[PDB]
Amino acid sequence: ASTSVAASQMRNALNALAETVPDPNERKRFEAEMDNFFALFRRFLNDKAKGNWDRIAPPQPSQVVNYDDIGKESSVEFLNKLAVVKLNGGLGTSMGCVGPKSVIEVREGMSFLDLSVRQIEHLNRTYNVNVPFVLMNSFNTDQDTQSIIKKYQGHNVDIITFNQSRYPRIIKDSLLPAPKSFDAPLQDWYPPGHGDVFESLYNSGTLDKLLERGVEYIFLSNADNLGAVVDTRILQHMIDTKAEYIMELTDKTKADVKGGTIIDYEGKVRLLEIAQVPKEHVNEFKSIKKFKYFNTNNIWMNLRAIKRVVEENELEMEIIANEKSIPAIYQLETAVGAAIRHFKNAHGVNVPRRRFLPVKTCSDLLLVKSDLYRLEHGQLVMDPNRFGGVPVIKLGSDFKKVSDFQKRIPSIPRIVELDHLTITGAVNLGRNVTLKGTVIIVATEGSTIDIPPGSVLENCVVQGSLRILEH
Amino acid sequence: SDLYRLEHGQLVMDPNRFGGVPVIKLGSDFKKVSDFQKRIPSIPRIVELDHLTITGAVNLGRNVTLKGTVIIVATEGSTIDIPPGSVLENCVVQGSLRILEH
Amino acid sequence: SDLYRLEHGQLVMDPNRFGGVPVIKLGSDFKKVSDFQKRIPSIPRIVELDHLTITGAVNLGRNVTLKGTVIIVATEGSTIDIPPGSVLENCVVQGSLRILEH
Amino acid sequence: ASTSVAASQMRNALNALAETVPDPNERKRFEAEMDNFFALFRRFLNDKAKGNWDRIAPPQPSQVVNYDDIGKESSVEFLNKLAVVKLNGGLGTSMGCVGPKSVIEVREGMSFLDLSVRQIEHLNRTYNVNVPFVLMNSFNTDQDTQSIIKKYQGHNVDIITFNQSRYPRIIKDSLLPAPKSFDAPLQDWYPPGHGDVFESLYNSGTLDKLLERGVEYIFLSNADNLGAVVDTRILQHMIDTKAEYIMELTDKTKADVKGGTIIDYEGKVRLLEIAQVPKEHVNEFKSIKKFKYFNTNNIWMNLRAIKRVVEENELEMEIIANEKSIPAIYQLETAVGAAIRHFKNAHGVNVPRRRFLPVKTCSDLLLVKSDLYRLEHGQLVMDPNRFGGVPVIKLGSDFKKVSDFQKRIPSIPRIVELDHLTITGAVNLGRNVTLKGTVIIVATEGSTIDIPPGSVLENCVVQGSLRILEH
């Protein structure tokens, strides 16, 4: 009974916000937006009252296509109908940086956004075609974004921006929205999951704006994955298979045992994570067998398919519950891959790892700024002279914040011919440091190790304390 | 060191060296000529060096370059293994650092 | 270790082991085969181990299990007595720990 | 087949040594002595070639008599037939002391042997009876023993001494006796287990010497257990039950989980230890249930029964194999309790723990020298004011040798009202130190803690380093 009472109170609270609003257009948007959460909230309570490893069958050979099997490059003429959409909801707060994550620099002063545009520019200049580049922004970044985007004026680049849905936070105890007024503080709201993209594209009118230029194929990728470069080869497979949803996949490395994996689920290709795998089978799920692929989040989609699922309202997503404590609330989120099940001819492709190089933590930023990578017209390609895979770098807990990183490593060490590197404690690397083979540095608790400039280290362990002060 | 060249058996200082000979004063640990080969397997480059002091256990790897003034003061009883290729310019070095093969 | 089994005198690695053989590199203290029996009275379980480094005085108790990468760096001159039954997963270990019978 | 070959070679080697002998009396002794080992060696190989927890049934209520149930003290008249025999095979080498263990001092300069005689002396003077006191010596101690025993001359004390069997060491590889000649070095011989007492008493003529004074009851106890005082109460139970073998037992404490325990074995009361309990059940055997008693080694026996088992050759013992490395060899030994099976009406008595206080290690010598015990005419009785059991004292590895003990603890600390004490590392205790409750001392590795004189410690942890040097 309490569920119906809560639903009634929730409905009245959701409607009360919709009643206190200054403009009709906002009311229309807010009503449709807020009415979706009422249904979600109902399912959430119902799904908890209702609460299968047997159904977790391995992906059949028919469900995965190999990149080496795809045919010749797609003709330039077909690129006019392609479209690229980027998630732009990440703040630099994740890495202790001010502003949006997209604005933080990576190499030679360029921002992560800069490379994307630069990649778009490379396509237009090589064939004189204008691929639309849409940014799914967030309320936390739009204000900073609206400022910085002006730097891209002039240059032949069609930039369009929109803000995703702004749902309010729901009080954990009362199960009611924390904000009362329409102009309530941002702390009362949170951005929902990636799946909001489909409706957001429509609700903002971007779908019309996109349809206005006749784009038929949509490509999504996270701004954090610099490897998501436009490759005309993949578009041909799409044009041939006319699939409604194609996800790029990669073979799980030792570090990719965790994270989502595609499941056949009786042909109806699905996905699952630790968020829903039963604890009694997580160890089984972590086995290298049966689950050999993971979700890269690089996805190719049909714009009219997106329209149809929205027009049909068939879009139903796996709710993800997150909690926070406002100085307690619940948040509902969704994944970009979960939509795979509701699409015809939906199947995946396995691509070489050169397409997945995320920048989530300090250990990544060092690899990209080193001499191991070179930028050509905005594309990062590893030196063909490098044998084996990428070297493993794992810095200690002292290098968490991106600001401090510049203090301890004023110049990036030469990492060619390096095999494995571990750094723990206070370590300062001078200029022109060369590392070869395996290098293990373990600073004494509370002491500092100042690696002398010009140092050449080969297969050795370093431990102790060394101070270098100017005479 | 590389500061001297042998011609038909005569030592002549490099005409490129400005000023007098640099002052080198090693600590009490390097007294015996036999041990000298253990701690300094390869002589460091001493061109452009001004003054050098070494006290305590100091091991110099190959291709070490010293410029200006270099003062090395090892902790009593501990050892300082200067990593190979090190380039030192006008600075004081103190502490302990072990380099063991992996 | 438990990674190999002998059948009529032939060694074949367990087909369950993925990838190549794990890399093991013990420190300079374990040179002599006699001492080896003192510090490692029972071989640690090495299935699912990826990389292991041991430097300095390290004593491994019985039923020690190592998973992923394990780096043990003993303090110069001190000893680390890994307690029996220890299960280590992807971590660095440094310090000194003595286990004496009550 | 190899067993017969080894037995044949052993026989020839044993007989060859017995043939090369200077005197007939030795030949008589050596022939009987050496012939016993041939039979033992045969059984050893046979038992090894042949190689039951199901049969390990708990002791039935009929197998154990309680000390509180035994009747009134036995009348003085019945004491003329009692006899006490002591094992005197322990060397001070076990505790890093020179000479026999029996000679090392315990309190006020008295040796462990001194107290035994002193206990006998008190008994003879209170009733004018002369109980014979026989010492089962060893070749390792007789030479020092023959010297020191002279100090007991004059005083009304009948002292008789004899040496137990001297068996040769058997080479591990050849399975042959290591010594060749008759005058071979002592390193080629070893004293066998306690069970050798029965034959040794006979073969030495001591049985005649005892029978010559009409003694009918024999009592055995180890010289190391100062609690083995002659108590006329137990002799009455013997006179009443006329049992052929009575062993004193005590309830296993937390420290007595290990060590031998009586087993009913279908009425045929036996004993077993880790030496024969199956490894798959040792953990089960260590449980507090089923095995609640352990062997104290205090045993009461009938002298004519001992004679009969020797005359009848019914004496069969559980062989114990021990190994040594002469600067490898095998040694065969037996336990004083195992003989229980070959005796009629053999049953045990459970006595209060005041009868078991061994002196095996440093932790024992501290308890006995403290103010917690007082000596009256040579008998130790704990102060009736002490509540609870004896306090637990466990000194660290630095106090192993008895010589060093005098350096770090020049005066014993007051231990009344002490509950638990732990000492690790270099700790020096000054004079007049008082400990109350629980005291934990943990010295820093390599440093020393000099507890200042007069210190009073109550329920506390002590850690650090403190030096006291004369001004």
Residue numbers in the entry:
A (entry chain C), D (entry chain H): 32 to 82, 86 to 361, 371 to 514
B (entry chain F), C (entry chain G): 413 to 514
Task: Show sentences the authors wrote.
UDP (uridine diphosphate)-glucose pyrophosphorylase (UGP) is a central enzyme in the metabolism of carbohydrates that catalyzes the biosynthesis of UDP-glucose, a key precursor of fungal cell wall polysaccharides. UGPs catalyze the interconversion of UTP and Glc-1-P to UDP-Glc and PPi in a Mg2+-dependent reaction, following an ordered sequential Bi-Bi mechanism in which the uridine compound is the first to enter and the last to exit the active site. In this study, we demonstrate that in A. nidulans, galF (FungiDB ID AN9148) is an essential gene encoding a UTP-specific UGP, referred to as AnUGP, a central enzyme in the metabolism of carbohydrates and assembly of the cell wall. Each AnUGP subunit (57.6 kDa protein; 514 amino acids) is composed of three domains: (i) the α-helical N-terminal (NT) domain (residues 1–81, 199–227, 354–376), (ii) the catalytic glycosyltransferase A-like (GT-A-like) domain [residues 82–198, 228–353, 377–404 (29 - 31)] containing the active site, and (iii) the C-terminal (CT) oligomerization domain (residues 405–514) containing a left-handed parallel β-helix (LβH; residues Leu461–His514).
Endogenous native AnUGP was purified owing to its ability to bind a Ni-NTA affinity column without any added tag. To take advantage of the particle’s apparent symmetry and increase the resolution of the cryoEM map, we refined the data while applying D4 symmetry, resulting in a 3.98 Å structure. Afterward, a restrained local refinement, focusing on this single subunit, yielded a 3.5 Å cryoEM map for the AnUGP monomer with local resolution ranging from 3.0 to >6 Å. Accordingly, we present a model for residues 32–82, 86–361, and 371–514 of AnUGP. Overall, cryoEM analysis of native AnUGP in solution indicates it is a homoctamer with pseudo-D4 symmetry broken by flexibility between the CT oligomerization domains and the central catalytic domains. Octameric AnUGP can be described as a tetramer of homodimers held together by two interfaces on the CT LβH, which is built of short β-strands (β17–β23) oriented parallel to each other and describing a triangular prism. The cryoEM map of the LβH region shows high local resolution (up to 3.2 Å), allowing the oligomerization interface to be described. Two AnUGP subunits build the homodimer through “end-to-end” contacts between their C-terminal extended β-strands, forming an extended intermolecular β-sheet and a joint β-helix. The UDP-Glc binding site faces toward the inner cavity of the complex with four pockets each in both the upper and lower rings. AnUGP displays a strong preference for UTP and, accordingly, in the structure, it is evident that the presence of small residues, Gly123 and Gly124, in the NB loop is vital for reducing steric clashes with the uridine moiety.
